[PDB]
Design a protein around this ligand. Structure first.
Ligand SMILES: C[S@@](=O)[C@@H]1[C@@H](N)[C@@H](O)[C@@H](O)[C@H]1O
Ligand SMILES: [Zn+2]
Length: 1016
């Protein structure tokens, strides 16, 4: 049955948390291999019957945006690289090349004439040009959500299967800044057999090299059996460039980068240039090179050696192809013919390397260690930890999550039908998937690109959001209009999306007001979509032009509602205060929407001349010295004023929250009789070093622990309502808001770091939870991994990615902070959680970007804060490397990442309107998600195919009795099912033909993909 992911600690040879606990981290000079040691080998190890097989693998690292935009690099560099690769490989049958970034390859191939397309297919089919990974990009592994890692992998691999007829089974990830086990998780479930990584902490490379544990079977941290394992090769040296890939001495290896002799504007910083290989020097040069290779080979277990040959945007000039190829050919001819070397060297591909390694393994020549854990936080040298990019450009980090959800919702809503080509659904969805996929690049979501490139990514994502809205609104119109009345124009806007949290209040006034009035329009239909496969209730809000509005469902049942003012915060350069202004012309109506699994529900907002029976009005209290009036147009309740004071609020039966006089949480009381548990929010700032290394887009190099932000006497606004209450405070750089709807609070920070150069703003939580040095952070929204703060490491090393959540706990109490955006964070002392909000850095951090981070813009960060009693929960043992969310924390995370979508009907009357869609959809167990629903066929296909990715998380058992729930069989969601197949996660290979056309549900922590086929 299902593996138990909680109670069995996997036995692995290397467990990265346990390795970290024992390892030294001292940064000692190792000699020519600066972060290693002087490698020694026995010359007699290799002989006539046991040769060293060396694969030199040419490559060219092509960033889809970094210092130039995607299109700029394509025009200036990549189109020439690919064009010359085509010519040289065609003309030189033994030459090889690997290619990773399918975004560029697709951009290129579609501009090729048919003759060149045929030539390209021929060098792929014959194995000279080999795709590695085959994702749209080589994604970041820290900030990226697993759903988008899968999206981009699928976008590239679908392209490759369609046009090149190949599916890579070896992955190549040489540049992401640290590595996540989410990659082997997804890859192994997408048909992969091998992967390669590079950017791991120098101390880890040294430690694994010493034990020859650089090749390992990487399994998930909870995986006791090992079925998730994927063979992984970690490169041993500081870089993937040529000086750091031939062997341990870059002064020697640089001499074998033949692009460094002068005419290309490159040189060797170790001051010895390459020399052209000739008959007079080939024996000497070969001796030097083979010595490097044999040293590198000492670090690995087989007689097969991988020698990458490339660097950033290499293999551009024709003369470069010639100078690398001809010189290496001379070396190979000499080396291979000289028996005393006992080497056979050739150009190869990545798959060739791995195939040969496994042949050696099968021959009993090596056994490989098992490993679990991750490879964060990376440092490339000294104390230069790359934790800055966990937060850099947080506006776009938040936008990634918004677009993530919009892509899912647009693909799901439109999947229910086949669409005529004229509707352009496929075109708009392809654009949206491609722009989101592009952003997963390790200079996109990471915030490590130049300012103008960040703008290009933002513009692309904005177009993607527009494409999603277009598809979603056409889909809603079709799903909720009587079929014999449905009369689409595919260019028309039937609904517009209303999104309360993006870009967010104080970021952009983008929200439409619903305009009602007795002399213009009495009522308006709104529709909510629920992408999750269970019935869901959530409060939703709309802006309306009158406070006297009531809500009904589409059986005309009254729905309880609350009206609140529209508050906006302003930095008053007159009074030098940050304070709220109330609209006199628009108001917020809030009500609970209840929506079917993967479904839609329609409500109606109707104006009246006086207070409606089922609508209540919030009270408002402005706490500040020297108040002035706050009129609210027609709003029926007068604003109250007071001097700053502590206050307490409770919505529904939910927790009671107490706040300081500065408007920051101080305690949470779960129930009437329970204790007020200290939980204190605080804002602090980190600075930058005046001496030595400066923080920049990649590096976090604080000048000591953070200092409290001086708050002064901030203005605090308290809104108290039956359905929703909140406390908001205008702090320097942050409007901080705590919202209560009757369960775990929502936190929203409108963060505007303004002109505070060399400042990183952090939000900290201080509690009495006896967490010690332990805390938990997630990896890619997929899993929670145990972290241990280590005082042998500097502060910035104890920062980890917080892509979706983090928690601390003791025997009795847990505090979980869920996020709607990836940010960096830590627990720097027992009982603390902290998460960086934004950072503004005046200096470059010497990794090639050539700028600081001075392009900040206001961003609305969102969170849920979940305090829970956990003494009754069945948790993993002390030695287990994983943690797991509770039901409430998981639901809270879903509320941030996949909220209900809200649609406002755009014209006066919707003829043929329907009340609901999806009422008959199964309401699946709470731990199960339909992560993806995507129709895979266009309308002309006789057999329609729809793909589903199902993910089951693992939630802690804490004694809440399990309810019923319906089995979800995705293969029967659409009618006329003719076949149901389990597939790889990319949908590209059929793995199992399913009995009865029934797709089984998956085990905890497992993800599966199914494709249903339908006669049409
Ligand atoms: C961290 S820089 O070395 C890295 C470059 N290799 C380039 O590929 C881009 O990704 C940049 O961030
Ligand atoms: Zn790169």
């Amino acid at each position: 049955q299902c593996q138990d992911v909680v109670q069995d600690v996997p036995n692995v040879d290397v467990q990265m948390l346990e390795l970290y606990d024992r390892m030294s981290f001292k940064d000692i000079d190792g000699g020519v291999w600066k972060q290693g040691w002087n490698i020694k080998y026995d010359p007699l190890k290799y002989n006539a019957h046991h040769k060293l097989k060396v694969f030199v693998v040419p490559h060219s690292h092509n960033d889809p945006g970094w210092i130039q935009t995607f299109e700029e690099y394509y025009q200036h560099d990549t189109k020439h690289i690919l064009s010359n690769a085509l010519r040289h490989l065609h003309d030189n049958p033994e030459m090889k090349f690997i290619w990773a970034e399918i975004s560029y390859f697709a951009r290129f191939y579609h501009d090729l004439g048919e003759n060149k397309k045929l030539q390209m297919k021929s060098i792929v089919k014959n194995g000279q040009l080999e795709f590695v990974t085959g994702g749209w990009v080589m994604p970041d592994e820290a900030n990226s959500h697993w759903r988008n890692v899968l999206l981009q992998l699928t976008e590239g691999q679908t392209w490759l299967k369609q046009f090149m007829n190949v599916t890579p089974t070896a992955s190549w990830a040489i540049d992401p800044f640290g590595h996540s086990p989410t990659m082997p998780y997804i890859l192994q479930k997408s048909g992969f057999k091998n992967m390669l990584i590079q950017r791991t902490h120098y101390s880890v490379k040294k430690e694994l090299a010493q034990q020859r544990q650089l090749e390992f079977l990487w399994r998930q941290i909870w995986d006791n059996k090992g079925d998730t394992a994927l063979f992984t090769h970690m490169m041993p040296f500081y870089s993937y460039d040529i000086p750091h890939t031939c062997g341990p001495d870059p002064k020697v290896c640089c001499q074998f980068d033949f692009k460094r002799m002068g005419s290309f504007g490159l040189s060797c910083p170790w001051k010895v240039p390459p020399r052209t290989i000739s008959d007079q020097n080939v024996a000497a040069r070969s001796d030097l090179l083979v010595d490097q290779w044999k040293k590198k080979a000492e670090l690995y277990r087989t007689n097969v050696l991988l020698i990458p040959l490339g660097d950033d945007f290499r293999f551009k000039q024709n003369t470069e192809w010639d100078v690398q190829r001809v010189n290496y050919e001379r070396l190979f001819e000499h080396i291979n013919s000289q028996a005393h070397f006992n080497v056979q060297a050739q150009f190869g591909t990545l798959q060739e390397y791995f195939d040969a390694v496994h042949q050696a393994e099968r021959a009993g020549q090596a056994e490989f260690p098992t490993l679990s854990g991750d490879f964060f936080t990376y440092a490339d040298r000294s104390d230069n930890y790359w934790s800055g990019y966990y937060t850099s450009r947080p506006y776009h980090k938040r936008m990634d999550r918004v677009l993530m959800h919009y892509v899912r919702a647009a693909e799901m809503l439109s999947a229910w039908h086949s669409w005529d080509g004229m509707a352009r659904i496929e075109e708009r969805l392809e654009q949206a998937r491609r722009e989101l996929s592009l952003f997963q690049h390790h200079d996109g979501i990471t915030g490590t690109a130049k300012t103008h490139v960040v703008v290009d990514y933002e513009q692309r994502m904005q177009e993607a959001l527009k494409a999603c809205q277009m598809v979603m609104q056409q889909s809603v119109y079709r799903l909720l209009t009587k079929p014999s009345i449905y009369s689409p124009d595919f260019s028309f806007s039937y609904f517009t999306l209303d999104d309360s949290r993006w870009p967010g209040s104080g970021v952009e006034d983008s929200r439409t007001t619903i305009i009602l009035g007795e002399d213009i329009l009495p009522s308006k239909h709104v529709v909510m979509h629920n992408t999750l496969p269970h019935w869901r209730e959530q409060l939703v809000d709309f802006y309306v032009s009158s406070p006297f509005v009531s809500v009904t469902d589409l059986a005309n049942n009254p729905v309880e509602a609350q009206v609140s003012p529209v508050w906006s915060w302003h930095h008053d350069t007159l009074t030098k205060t940050i304070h709220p202004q109330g609209s006199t012309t628009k108001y917020r109506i809030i009500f609970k929407a209840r929506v079917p699994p993967m479904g839609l529900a329609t409500y109606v907002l109707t104006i009246s001349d006086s207070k409606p029976e089922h609508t209540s009005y919030a009270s408002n209290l402005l706490l500040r010295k020297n108040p002035t009036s706050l009129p609210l147009g027609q709003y029926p309740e007068d604003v109250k004023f007071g001097d700053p004071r502590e206050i307490s609020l409770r919505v529904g039966n939910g927790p009671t929250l107490a706040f300081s006089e500065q408007g920051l949480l101080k305690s949470i009381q779960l129930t009437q009789d329970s204790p007020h548990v200290p939980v204190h929010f605080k804002f602090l700032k980190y600075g930058v070093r005046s001496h030595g290394d400066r923080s920049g887009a990649y590096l976090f190099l604080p000048n000591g622990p953070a200092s409290p932000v001086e708050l002064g006497q901030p203005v605090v606004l308290v809104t108290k309502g039956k359905l929703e209450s909140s406390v908001s405070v205008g702090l320097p750089s942050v409007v901080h808001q705590t919202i209560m709807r009757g369960g775990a609070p929502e936190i929203r920070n409108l963060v505007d770091i303004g002109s505070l150069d060399n400042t990183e703003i952090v939000m900290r939580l201080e509690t009495h939870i006896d967490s010690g040095d332990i805390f938990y952070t997630d990896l890619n929204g997929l899993q929670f991994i145990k972290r241990r703060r280590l005082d042998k490491l500097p502060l910035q090393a104890n920062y980890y990615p917080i892509p979706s959540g983090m928690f601390i706990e003791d025997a009795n109490t847990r505090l979980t902070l869920l996020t709607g955006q990836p940010l960096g964070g830590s627990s720097l002392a027992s009982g603390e959680l902290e998460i960086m909000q934004d950072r503004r850095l005046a200096s470059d951090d010497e990794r090639g970007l050539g700028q600081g981070v001075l392009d900040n813009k206001p961003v609305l960060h969102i969170y849920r804060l979940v305090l829970e009693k956990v003494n009754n929960c069945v948790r993993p043992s002390k030695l287990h490397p994983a943690g797991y969310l509770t039901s409430a924390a998981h639901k809270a995370s879903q509320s941030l990442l996949d909220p209900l979508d809200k649609f406002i009907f755009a014209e006066n009357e919707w003829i043929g309107a329907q009340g609901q869609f999806g009422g008959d959809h199964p309401s699946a167990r709470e731990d199960l998600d339909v992560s993806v629903m995507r129709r895979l066929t266009k309308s002309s296909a006789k057999t329609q195919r729809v793909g589903y990715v199902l993910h089951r998380t693992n939630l802690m058992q804490c004694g809440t009795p399990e309810e019923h729930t319906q089995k979800l069989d995705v293969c029967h969601l659409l009618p006329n099912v003719a076949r149901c197949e389990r597939t790889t996660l990319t949908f590209l290979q059929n793995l199992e033909h399913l009995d009865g056309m029934v797709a089984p549900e998956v085990c905890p922590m497992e993800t599966a993909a199914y494709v249903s086929s339908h006669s049409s």
